[PDB]
Design a protein around this nucleic acid. Structure first.
Ligand SMILES: Nc1nc2c(ncn2[C@@H]2O[C@H](COP(=O)(O)OP(=O)(O)O)[C@@H](O)[C@H]2O)c(=O)[nH]1
Ligand SMILES: Nc1nc2c(ncn2[C@@H]2O[C@H](COP(=O)(O)OP(=O)(O)O)[C@@H](O)[C@H]2O)c(=O)[nH]1
Ligand code: ALF
Ligand code: ALF
Ligand SMILES: [Mg+2]
Ligand SMILES: [Mg+2]
Lengths: 293, 271
RNA sequence: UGUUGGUUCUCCCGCAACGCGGAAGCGUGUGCCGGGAUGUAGCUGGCA
C-alpha cells in the first residue's frame, strides 16, 4: 500500500521537478491515514508528519528513479530514528540486587513478562533471581507467578492476598539483600491510570524499593487510548523501559510509536508468545516496517 | 465550519472508531445536517447519536439463557481481555435470576487458569468442573456439559484459553471444542461470546473476523470500559458482522457487569 | 463401590496441519476425541 500510494501522489501532482511542499499535500494526508489504521495515536501522527514535511521541502528527489521509493526511504529512516537504538538493556551493572518493577494495565502481560525475564536473567546473564508478586487483587495471580517461577528455575518469594503490597515488596527486597540475590523482579497488579488509589499504590511501591528499572508493559494491539495511559504512567513513575507484548499477533502495532513518543522511553523487549521462552530484543527497523506494513 | 470538520473528525478518531467507519458516519451526517438544515449544535449532537444508534440497533438483542439444559455459553477471544473475569460476573447474574450455573475450566493452557476459575466458583458457590493445566480443553468442556445434563444444571459457562487469531492451529483447536459439543446438543454452543478489551484498536476487527469465521459468533462482551477507553471500534465490527453486544465490563468486582444498553454506551462515549 | 467414555503422564506407530530451518531436519497449547502397549497409577464424565 505504502510504496504505491506515495508513488501515485508523487507522479500525479509533480512531474520531473525537485520535490517542493506543494507536491507533498496528498502524500502527507495518506501517510496519516496509514498510521491511523495502524493504531498510532493521532497527535503522534501530526508530529511525525511535520518532520516528514521538513524532509519534504528540501527534497533531493527528482534524481532517483521512483519518487515513492525515495520518499519511503525517508519515512522509514525517520521512523527507525524515532523508535530508538538497538542493544537496549536492563542496568545489571550497578549495586545488587538489581530491582526491576513492572507496571501497566490489566492483562497487559506483566506476570508472563516477569517469568520471561526470570528465564532470560538466570539462563543468559547467569543471575541469581528472586521474583515476587504484589498482586493481591486478581485471583490466583500469585500462584500464576509462583508457577512461572517454578517453571523457569527461579526462586519465588511467597505472598498472599491478606498482605499489603508495600509490606510485600519491602519484605522481598529485604530477603534479596540478605540472601545476596543478583536480581529482584517485582510483579504488580494491573491498574488503570484513572484509579487514584492504585496509582498511589504503585507510586508508593516504587518509592519503597527505589528500583533501577521500571518497565511499562503495554499490549501491542492497543489503540488510541495508549496516548492517555502512557502519559499518566510516564508522569506517575520514572520509567526506564517499555515492554511491548503480544507482537506475535497481527496487529500493526502503532501504539509502539505513540508510547515511544509520549514517554520518550526506550522499548527494551518484545513479548512474542505466551510461553516463557517467548522474549525478543527490540529492533527499531523491524517494528518500523511492521507499522508501515 | 472547517474547524468543525477537523474537530469532530478528531473526536471520532481518538475513540478508536476507525477511518472507514468515520467516513461512513460523517458522510451520512453531512447529508442529514444539510438536509434538515440544522443551525445549532445540540441538534447536531442529536443527529450524530441517532445515526450511531442505527448501527447499534442491529446488535442490541439481550442474551436469553432460559429453555435449555444446560444453556451453553462458550467464551472466546484473545489474551488477557477478561473472559474469565466476565464468566465470574455472569455466574452471579444468572444465580440472581434463579438459574443453577456450572463452570467449565476449559483454559487448560495458561498458568493458574483453573485456580482462577475456581476462585470465581467459590465466590459464586457453584460447581466448577476442571481437570488440570495440560488436560484436553475439548474433553474438559464436554465432560462439563454431560455433567450439567446429569445434574439438571440450567446454564453451563465454558472458559477457553485466550488465543491470538492469526495462530491458525489454535483456531482449529477451538473448532474441535465446538464440534465435540455437537455430540450432546446440536444447537450448542447456544452462545459463542467474543470478548473484546475496550483498549483495543483496529485489530478488534481482525479478531471479530477470524473468530467469527472459525466458530460463528453470537455475542460480544466489551470489557474494561471502567477506564478512559470508549471502545469505538465496535461500530466497525457491528457494521461488518452484526454481532449482538451482550454486556459491558466496568471493573473487577463480581458486580461490575452491566447488560449492554446502547443509550448508556452513547452517553459514555461522548463525555 | 459396580460398568463404561474421556484425558494426562511413560513406551510404540500412522496420516495430515502448523512453526522454525537452504535442505536433510527439529519441534508441537494442531487435527483425525487416529492407532496401539501400559500403570498397582492419577484426574474427569455418565449410568446401576
Ligand atoms: N500471545 C501472547 N500472549 C501473551 C503475551 N504476554 C502475555 N500474554 C498472555 O496474556 C494473558 C495475560 O497475561 P498476564 O501476564 O497475566 O497479564 P498481567 O495481568 O499484566 O499479569 C495471558 O494469557 C498471557 O499468556 C505475548 O507476548 N503473546
Ligand atoms: N478494570 C477492569 N479490569 C478488568 C475488566 N475485566 C477484566 N479485567 C481484568 O483483566 C485481567 C485479565 O482478565 P482475565 O479474565 O484473567 O483475562 P482472560 O485471559 O481473557 O481470561 C484481570 O486482572 C481482570 O481483573 C473490566 O471490565 N475492567
Ligand atoms: F491481571 Al494483571 F497484572 F493485570 F495480573
Ligand atoms: F489469560 Al487468558 F484467556 F488470555 F486466561
Ligand atoms: Mg499479573
Ligand atoms: Mg482466562
Amino acid at each position: 500500500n505504502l510504496t504505491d500510494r506515495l508513488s501515485r501522489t508523487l507522479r500525479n501532482i509533480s512531474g520531473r521537478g525537485r520535490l517542493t511542499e506543494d507536491n507533498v499535500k496528498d502524500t502527507l494526508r495518506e501517510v496519516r491515514m496509514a498510521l491511523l489504521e495502524a493504531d498510532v495515536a493521532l497527535p503522534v501522527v501530526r508530529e511525525f508528519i511535520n518532520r516528514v514535511k521538513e524532509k519534504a521541502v528540501g527534497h533531493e528527489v527528482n534524481k532517483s528513479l521512483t519518487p515513492g521509493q525515495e520518499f519511503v526511504k525517508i519515512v522509514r529512516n525517520e521512523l527507525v530514528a524515532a523508535m530508538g537504538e538497538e542493544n537496549q538493556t536492563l542496568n545489571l551493572a550497578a549495586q545488587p540486587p538489581a530491582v526491576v518493577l513492572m507496571a501497566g494495565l490489566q492483562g497487559a502481560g506483566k506476570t508472563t513478562s516477569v517469568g520471561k525475564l526470570g528465564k532470560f536473567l538466570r539462563e543468559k546473564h547467569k543471575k541469581k533471581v528472586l521474583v515476587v508478586s504484589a498482586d493481591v487483587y486478581r485471583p490466583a495471580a500469585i500462584k500464576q507467578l509462583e508457577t512461572l517461577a517454578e517453571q523457569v528455575g527461579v526462586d519465588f518469594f511467597p505472598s498472599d492476598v491478606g498482605q499489603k503490597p508495600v509490606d510485600i515488596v519491602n519484605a522481598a527486597l529485604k530477603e534479596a539483600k540478605l540472601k545476596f540475590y543478583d536480581v529482584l523482579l517485582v510483579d504488580t497488579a494491573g491498574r488503570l491510570h484513572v484509579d487514584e488509589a492504585m496509582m498511589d499504590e504503585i507510586k508508593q511501591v516504587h518509592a519503597s524499593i527505589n528500583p533501577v528499572e521500571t518497565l511499562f508493559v503495554v499490549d501491542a494491539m492497543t489503540g488510541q487510548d495508549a496516548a492517555n495511559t502512557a502519559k499518566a504512567f510516564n508522569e506517575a513513575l520514572p520509567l526506564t523501559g517499555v515492554v511491548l507484548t503480544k507482537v506475535d499477533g497481527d496487529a500493526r502495532g502503532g501504539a509502539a510509536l505513540s508510547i515511544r513518543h509520549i514517554t520518550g522511553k526506550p522499548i527494551k523487549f518484545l513479548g512474542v508468545g505466551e510461553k516463557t521462552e517467548a522474549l525478543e530484543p527490540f529492533h527499531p527497523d523491524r517494528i518500523a516496517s511492521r507499522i508501515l506494513g | 465550519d472547517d474547524d468543525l470538520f477537523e474537530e469532530l473528525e478528531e473526536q471520532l478518531l481518538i475513540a478508536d472508531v476507525g477511518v472507514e467507519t468515520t467516513r461512513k458516519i460523517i458522510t451520512n451526517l453531512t447529508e442529514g445536517a444539510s438536509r434538515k438544515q440544522l443551525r445549532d449544535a445540540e441538534a447536531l449532537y442529536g443527529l450524530l447519536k441517532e445515526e450511531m444508534g442505527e448501527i447499534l440497533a442491529k446488535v442490541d438483542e439481550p442474551l436469553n439463557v432460559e429453555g435449555k439444559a444446560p444453556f451453553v455459553i462458550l467464551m472466546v477471544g484473545v489474551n488477557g481481555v477478561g473472559k474469565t473475569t466476565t464468566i465470574g460476573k455472569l455466574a452471579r447474574q444468572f444465580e440472581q435470576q434463579g438459574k443453577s450455573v456450572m463452570l467449565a475450566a476449559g483454559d487448560t493452557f495458561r498458568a493458574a487458569a483453573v485456580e482462577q476459575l475456581q476462585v470465581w466458583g467459590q465466590r459464586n458457590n457453584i460447581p466448577v468442573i476442571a481437570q488440570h493445566t495440560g488436560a484436553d480443553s475439548a474433553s474438559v468442556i464436554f465432560d462439563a456439559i454431560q455433567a450439567a445434563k446429569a445434574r439438571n444444571i440450567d446454564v453451563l459457562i465454558a472458559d477457553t484459553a485466550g488465543r491470538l487469531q492469526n495462530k491458525s492451529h489454535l483456531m482449529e483447536e477451538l473448532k474441535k471444542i465446538v464440534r465435540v459439543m455437537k455430540k450432546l446438543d446440536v444447537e450448542a454452543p447456544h452462545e459463542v461470546m467474543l470478548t473484546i478489551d475496550a483498549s483495543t484498536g483496529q485489530n478488534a476487527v481482525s479478531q471479530a473476523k477470524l473468530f467469527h469465521e472459525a466458530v460463528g459468533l453470537t455475542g460480544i462482551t466489551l470489557t474494561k470500559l471502567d477506564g478512559t477507553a470508549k471502545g469505538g471500534v465496535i461500530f466497525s465490527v457491528a457494521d461488518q458482522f452484526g454481532i449482538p453486544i451482550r454486556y459491558i465490563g466496568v471493573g473487577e468486582r463480581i458486580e461490575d457487569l452491566r447488560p449492554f444498553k446502547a443509550d448508556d454506551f452513547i452517553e459514555a462515549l461522548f463525555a
